[PDB]
């Protein structure tokens, strides 16, 4: 319906947000643990 | 395509 697409857009959008900063913080810690 | 597949199923299903 017309409300199902709006819910999917907003859930997808906040999913994109949390996936983005999860990957960003995780790879930040990855490049951080590189230590010599 | 996979997301709107359920949408057109519900369009053809509901009607």
């Amino acid at each position: 319906l017309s409300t199902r697409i709006i819910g999917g857009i907003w859930w997808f959008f906040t999913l994109i947000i949390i996936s983005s900063y999860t990957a960003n913080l995780a790879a930040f810690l990855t490049v951080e643990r590189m230590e010599s | 395509l996979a997301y709107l597949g359920v949408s057109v199923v519900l369009f053809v299903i509901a009607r």
Side-chain angles (χ1 to χ4, degrees), chain B residues 3-15:
Chain B
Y3 173 42
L4 203 140
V6 177
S7 314
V8 287
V9 158
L10 275 156
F11 180 44
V12 168
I13 301 180
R15 178 181 56 88

Side-chain angles (χ1 to χ4, degrees), chain A:
Chain A
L1 295 174
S2 84
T3 189
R4 293 182 183 174
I5 49 178
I6 294 169
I9 285 161
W10 172 229
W11 174 70
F12 177 94
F13 188 83
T14 191
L15 260 190
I16 279 287
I17 293 173
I18 64 177
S19 311
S20 313
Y21 189 52
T22 296
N24 201 19
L25 181 69
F28 181 63
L29 295 196
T30 298
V31 83
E32 254 178 315
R33 292 181 83 137
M34 285 270 172
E35 299 172 314
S36 175

